[PDB]
Amino acid sequence: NALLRYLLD
Amino acid sequence: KPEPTDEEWELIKTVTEAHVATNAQGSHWKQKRKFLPEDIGQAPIDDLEAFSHFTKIITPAITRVVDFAKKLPMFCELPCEDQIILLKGCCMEIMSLRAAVRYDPESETLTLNGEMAVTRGQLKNGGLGVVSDAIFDLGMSLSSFNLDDTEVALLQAVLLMSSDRPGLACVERIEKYQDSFLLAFEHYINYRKHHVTHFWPKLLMKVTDLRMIGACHASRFLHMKVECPTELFPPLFLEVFE
Ligand SMILES: Cc1nc(C(=O)NCC(=O)O)c(O)c2ccc(Oc3ccccc3)cc12
């Protein structure tokens, strides 16, 4: 889920 | 019949302005509409080139849902692993809700990204199967409801704050957020005095339709793990629909 986790920051 | 308290108005304003700030083409979607040519997506002998086309068309749309959720203080007050679960659960539902309110009965089309009119056949034979019919039929019925920016937004937040999603830590925090939104939405409805009878139960039934749309994607993606490698789709599509 790396890209979702980056976007949610 | 009760209308919004002061706390609900502040909540109504927060979620409305988050929606308005992330709705593609804000309000100049009405004449930024370019119609996808009838060559892409009709009855077969589905095509993999229209499926890839739509896969790139939907990636801005997902980005705008994330931006919408990040503009909610309640959503941000949540652990990161919960935010991820909530966003995965409601992404398709909100995008289908945003397309269905832009239904035009003249052309019988929805507009994607505030810019692209598609027909029921193009979306169906472009990969969505029965879900295409579900979104259009939803679009046709919502014409009656005359939902404004505030109502759409509240709908999105209710979808977003679904505490029944597997893996969620703070089920109760989510559920008291969702119930704030639910009360606020009901009271705003009371104040707007839509002419349609029993507006609020009828709305509650449309949320379920949306949840049905969102939950038909453990089906329509194994639809397209059969013919291709995974590398052909944008990373963000794969992360939301997996
Ligand atoms: C359901 C919805 N919505 C939107 C959308 O932008 N709605 C308006 C908005 O978000 O502002 C899309 O752009 C979609 C694009 C493709 C799609 O199905 C497919 C996705 C991948 C492959 C085939 C069909 C559904 C969309």
Author numbering:
A (entry chain C): 741 to 749
B (entry chain A): 211 to 255, 264 to 460
Wording from the paper:
As expected, the native ligand T3 abolished or substantially diminished the transcriptional activity of four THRβ mutants associated with thyroid hormone resistance, V264D, H435L, R438H, and R438W, respectively (Wakasaki et al., 2016, Nomura et al., 1996, Sabet and Pallotta, 2011, Narumi et al., 2010). Surprisingly, the treatment of roxadustat either enhanced or retained the transcriptional activity of these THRβ mutants, all leading to higher induced transcriptional activity than those of T3. In contrast, the binding of roxadustat resulted in higher Tm values for four TRβ mutants than that of T3. Although all four mutant residues are located in the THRβ LBD, H435 is the only one that directly contacts ligands T3 or roxadustat, whereas the rest of the mutant residues are located outside the ligand-binding pocket, not in the range to form intimate contacts with the ligands, which makes us wonder how these mutants influence the ligand binding. To unravel the molecular basis for the RTH of the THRβ mutants and further their beneficial susceptibility to roxadustat, we performed structural studies on the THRβ mutants complexed with roxadustat. The structural analysis further revealed an apparent conformational change of residue H435 on helix 10 of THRβ for all four mutants, resulting in the loss of a critical hydrogen bond between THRβ and a critical hydroxy group of T3, which is also conserved for the other THR ligands identified so far, explaining the severely reduced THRβ activity by T3. Specifically, in addition to the direct mutation of H435 to the hydrophobic leucine of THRβ H435L, the allosteric conformational changes of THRβ H435 were coupled with several intermediate structural changes, predominantly in helix 10, which were initiated by mutants R438H, R438W, or V264D, consequently leading to impaired T3 binding.
